Amino acid sequence: SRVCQVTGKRPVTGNNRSHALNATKRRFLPNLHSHRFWVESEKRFVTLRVSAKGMRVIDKKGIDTVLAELRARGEKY
Template structure:
C-alpha cells in the first residue's frame, strides 16, 4: 500500500540530511500516517481510513460525513 493520506493527499517527499559539516545525503520525509476507524452515524458503520495527523485534525474540524462527501465527489471509493 502506498504511503498517501486519503484525506490530505500527503505523500513522501525527498530531501537531504545535512550534517554539521554540511555533508548532504539523500533521504525521504514520510507523512505521519495511521489507520483509523471513524464512526459514520448516518450509515451506522465504521469507515477505515489511512490518514495523517493533519487529516485527523481536518476530520475533527469538518466532521467525518463532510470529509467523506468531499472524497466521494473527488472519485475516491470507500
Template sequence: RFLPNLQHHRFWVESEKRFVRLRTSTKGMRIIDKRGIDAVLSDMRARGEKI
C-alpha cells in the same frame, strides 16, 4: 527524507450507522475532527475515491 505519520483509524459515520476505516495522517485526523467525517467523506466521493 519525508515520511508522513500515517495511521489506520476507524471513524464512526453516524449518517450511515457504520465504521469507516481510513489510512490517514495525523494532520488528516485533525481536519476530520474540524470539518466532520460526513463532509470529508462527501469530498472524497466527489473525487471518485473508494471508501
C-alpha cells in the same frame, strides 16, 4: 502507497544535512495511521489511512462532509 486519504500528503524528498553540510538524500514520510472512523448517518464504521493532521481535518470539518469530498474525487473509502 503512503498517501494520506484525506489531505493527500505523499512522501516528499529532501536532504539529510550533517554538521559539515554533507547532504545525503533522505525522504520525509507522512505520519500515516489506519483508524476506524464512525459515520453517524450510515451508522457503520469506516477504516481510512489517515495522517495525524488528517484526523484534525476530520475533526474540524464534518466527518461525513470530508467523506463527501473523497467521493467527489472518486476514491472509495
